[PDB]
Symmetry: D2
Amino acid sequence: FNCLGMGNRDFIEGASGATWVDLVLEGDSCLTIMANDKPTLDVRMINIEASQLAEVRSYCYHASVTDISTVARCPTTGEAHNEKRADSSYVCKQGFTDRGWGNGCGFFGKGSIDTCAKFSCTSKAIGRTIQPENIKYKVGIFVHGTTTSENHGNYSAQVGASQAAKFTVTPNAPSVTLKLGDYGEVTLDCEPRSGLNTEAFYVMTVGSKSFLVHREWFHDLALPWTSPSSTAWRNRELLMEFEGAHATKQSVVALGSQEGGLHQALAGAIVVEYSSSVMLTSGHLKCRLKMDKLALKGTTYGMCTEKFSFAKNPVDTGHGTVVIELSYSGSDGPCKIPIVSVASLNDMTPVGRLVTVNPFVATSSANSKVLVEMEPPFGDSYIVVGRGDKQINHHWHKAGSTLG
Amino acid sequence: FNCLGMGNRDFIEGASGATWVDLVLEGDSCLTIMANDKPTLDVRMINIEASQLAEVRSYCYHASVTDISTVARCPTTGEAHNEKRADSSYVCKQGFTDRGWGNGCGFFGKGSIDTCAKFSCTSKAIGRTIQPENIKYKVGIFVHGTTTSENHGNYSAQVGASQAAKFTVTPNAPSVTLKLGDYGEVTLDCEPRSGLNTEAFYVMTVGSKSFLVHREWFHDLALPWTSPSSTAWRNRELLMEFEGAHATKQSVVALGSQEGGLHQALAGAIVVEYSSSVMLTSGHLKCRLKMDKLALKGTTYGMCTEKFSFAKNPVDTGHGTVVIELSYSGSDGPCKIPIVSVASLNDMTPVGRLVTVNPFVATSSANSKVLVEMEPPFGDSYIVVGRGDKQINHHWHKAGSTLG
Amino acid sequence: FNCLGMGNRDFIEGASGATWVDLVLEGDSCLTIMANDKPTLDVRMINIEASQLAEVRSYCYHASVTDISTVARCPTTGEAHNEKRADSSYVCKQGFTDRGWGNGCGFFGKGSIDTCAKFSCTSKAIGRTIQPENIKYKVGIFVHGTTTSENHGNYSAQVGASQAAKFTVTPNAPSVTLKLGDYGEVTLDCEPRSGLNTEAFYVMTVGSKSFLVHREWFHDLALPWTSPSSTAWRNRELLMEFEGAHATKQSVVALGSQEGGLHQALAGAIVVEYSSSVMLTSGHLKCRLKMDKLALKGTTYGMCTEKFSFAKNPVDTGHGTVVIELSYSGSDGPCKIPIVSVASLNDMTPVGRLVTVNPFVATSSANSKVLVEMEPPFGDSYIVVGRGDKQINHHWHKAGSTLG
Amino acid sequence: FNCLGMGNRDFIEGASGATWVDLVLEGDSCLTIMANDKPTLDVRMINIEASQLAEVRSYCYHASVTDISTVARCPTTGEAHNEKRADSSYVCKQGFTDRGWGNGCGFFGKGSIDTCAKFSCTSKAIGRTIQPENIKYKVGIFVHGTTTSENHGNYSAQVGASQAAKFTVTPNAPSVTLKLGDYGEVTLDCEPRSGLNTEAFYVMTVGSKSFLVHREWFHDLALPWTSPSSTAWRNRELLMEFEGAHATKQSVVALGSQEGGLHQALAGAIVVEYSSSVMLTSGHLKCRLKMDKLALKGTTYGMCTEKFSFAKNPVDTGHGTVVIELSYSGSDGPCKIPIVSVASLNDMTPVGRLVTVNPFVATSSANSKVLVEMEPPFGDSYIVVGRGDKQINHHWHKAGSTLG
């Protein structure tokens, strides 16, 4: 639900003195937001849920052809009529067959036939339309408070400490205030109506899969169709072959399923999960994250007085940061972790910066663990933890591409 | 099995003094052969049977993907190996997933994965090749002896009177003599090796249907294949999608059946029935029909002496002939029917001609029926039946297209 | 201008007692109309002329790319601007090139460029629309009066004898009365508005040829376009390739002509001649031909008394008629030609019928020629010309398909 | 001809103690080679020249159709023969036209015609094949001796100082020794036969452009063709339309040029310059560069004693290096430039490394300039130039991606 470890992570820095930041969150992106005097926040799109889908029409890709009958007349006795032309379920076709004395006619020549067969649809793809007002954006937010290697990405654990929440914004309720315990509150003013091209396509369901197809390409589809406004199948003939007629009988058969060809045409189309409501992969939700009522807690606790150790030594996170896990030996917590990223032990001016702002031991229990993410400078530096003569340190070297 | 009534009927006239005629018989054609002093014959291709088909290869159009497993390793610990790479039934694929502290790795970055799945073919199309020496042409022959409206097209009935037979010619036995009772014998010298382009294509079986496809188009088919010379499926990946991998697991699924797309590509291809042997629609069999030992029987019987009547009045057959059915009142048969097609009753010179040459009452039973086909001249003429003062007659007018 | 000899000739027979006949005349068809007590008429569509074509838009299929210039800036000095972006005749494109000390920049990296080139259209296809009210149908009519082998199909010659005319019908003037001398007058009430699908397509001109293209297919054309409502070429880039940029210069070239590809897409499209006005191949003009004021002249002249001869013996015209040319030896004309088509010389009842109704020698000059078309019965008949003991005759036999 | 500034530059490091290095040089790549105790070398592919191209065949894409004639005969008089069927330059076609009395025939029906027209090819595309033994690889080599900002990329200037050469390798002479003055000699053993897929395609020339097309796709081309083995155009009809024949005349015209459609099919095909010989864009030439007889000159000259200055301050080259230009005030040259890249002025241990190994003032003239490229460590360092109390220095900070 938060960012550390994700492939797609971006860092957004609030401008100087600004209590808010503009965000563009997408289906796959995880954003880490850092603003002056604010705890660091992760924000990520979880999903987009469109609920009230309405059918536009259906196409049969697999038809059933049964109950074939042919009525026949001799040459010169007029056109055959098959009484099944009265049943709207049946497809009928006028034809002719060679007749003569050998097959029951007094005259030789073309005898009339009329051949019918029941058409039913075995499998159909249903096209549905999305209404822009029935679109829920679900978003996860995480505050970089105290966490461990083990629990950092554990949602229920972070909810536990008032350090994460999930919430929904809709066109109708595009703004949400959510309290984060002692951190106070953040609001998100989003623009859910300018997030998705809702009506430039349909949701089409084909078997176990559903797609986002063009709504024009969908109309031009060459298959038998039904609408709410036309319950009877039209263009049924597309899925049927009237075979060669002979004497007084004629075969009629349905094509095999056309599903495979649909998945063919549906190559570059987005795939989406559909049950009662559709879940959209692609998100483009703009939001303003407001942090005027968010606070950095723990900024004035006394500094932890006892020794720390590295439970996990620093590793490059691949996001242009470095992360450690500390274990704190003391039982004087809650307390502020003295930690800085410096150029040398002889000069303690902070040159690196913390992503986990204001790292904090939050319990009086001994040996609790605290994960800290930071951005050391390029070249050599040291991570120095602890104060006075309890300090520990670790060298770091941050480099980039080798020669090439 | 014979021609009267068929849509596709041609008339072939033996040349003057010639005891044989060259014939080209095709899948659908019925030939009526008339030669000097010979009874009229119908000859038609019944079918072409290729027996000893040999597989060239098979293509899977519907695959089954099961037993998916993924083995995963952390970044810097090397490439994952999935032990299923040892099973030739499984398709495997190297991949990578984002790993870090959050999903069990001491280091952040791309962790190796190796994902396998069993591939089995649910439905395959089998391509077979025809051997030009294993091709039977089955042919029906009919002699225009005595027949009735009722029995004319009845094979067992004509076999009864020695007036029809069926027979086979092969490359190995391309000539057949067949006795036709008192009519004697006819031989057919055919050229079965110059009848079919046997090796310019394959017989391909797709579900319940079989087709004659190009043997080059068949090689270029993009599907997983097996040969007798390679029992293991190759190019299996064509019917599989390795889905997105995440952490330590990855989905793998088979495409749906591709059958429908095959019937698509198989539009202008010939359809053929295949069980143990294939039956070919298209025939082009050249034969010489030899009639030197065939005779017109009944040419010197006494003329029937009693009255005839028209059981069926003359009708245009649509083949440029006219057909009647006579009933013969006499019991002096077997006897020759006196019948001619003349310009007027005052001039009995034959101007029309008989297709049923030498019509004959073949029994002493009273009231037997005899069908007679003939070609009256254009304009007015008369069909005159009987001799002396027992004669009956019917006017005929033969016209063509109205003004236009 | 009339029918004898044409491939596409139909015969239309006025109904009994009817002074008018409904006609459907098409681009290629020639109609012979026969009505009771009326001279026989030929009617044929000559052409359809749409005049007031209006442009809908134009597409350039061959462009000229000239006067290329590139303006370049060093990395860190900002985006290059090419002053030709002010000229609407020029197409411009922002780019980048590798820069460094070696090519005049204090800094290494991507330097900005801006490259322009003049676009002019060398050859364009112009799409025009037809207005249904500006459509002239030109029609030729011919009356089967006296004609010779030589002059029968000679328009100026028939106009000479008041036996042919040409005339126009428009939506605005859909009815025309035209006098035919002593034959009186015929009127044609046509429906020019229900003759052509005028607005389901455009007239498109590509070089020396013009076509009737879909008006939707025409919009979707992927070429640079101009309208009367937009005089500047849009989508010019379609006919240009901006080549690879290097340092401070970049090549830009036009594609070659696209004309050939248009003729490719224009395969099944109708071809039409366009100059000031378009001439349409396809006609479907409905007319009522009214003959209440048309008369058969010559019906009561005295019968020609002298000998005729066959200047040309009877030949099958291939239209289900037979035509002769007579020479008339007498100088008693104008006079009625006694000619009939009979079953035998011993029975002069007319059984054949004249297409050239009331054949007539129209001059007192000796040895004038008169062409006569007729429809003899099937089988044998005679053409008997002259009266009393001056009569000549010719046998005719009319047959149809040989046996087959 | 050398690398500094190029977009595509790679750095190759000779292995420890190794006097040779394996290189893969490609059409666009520039390689900088650094080996122990050797001057740094740049090596780049300049081009690949295939000379002895042989035609395989030619296709006409633009035909000229002229001198049309039609010979015609009346129905029943037999087939027309056009005497131009004797000229191999003419394309002829049998046809039929409606004939009758109106256009000079005694009989009505289909009259025979035979229509011919001269075919000449206006423009043709010629397909040529490359012989793997006639392929020259041209290669530029540069030694990182003394150079200035101004002359570094100036070939004639570097040849001047024995610091660059160009040379050719062929299948027949795949190895080249080239002397570089006081630097000694380098040899390149290349594998020109394993560099290009010479015979998997043809060189096809279409107007002003030439392409590398498949040699199979080239055979299947549907255009009129000629080979050295068949000087007469075959399949000419592809570029001609025999228009509708009428009476005794028939139009015949050539299609327009097909060139545009070729450039269409030739989208993803490589473009190459062809005159007498072809120049190939794509190179893949493997070479072993041997440096056993190459030496670092100047390694034991006395250190320059006077002051340097920065003529150009250090800039990031975008290749993961930094380059400066020094001006040397002294006139004691030739002399060794003391220059090092250190962590701090208080610790002169070299931590950065020189790409311009052993930088050297090569003249006694005052104020000569010397360019130096180097790779400082990440973070802070200093470039220190000069010895004793004549030293100058410049701070450097090398960083990478900002937070994100």
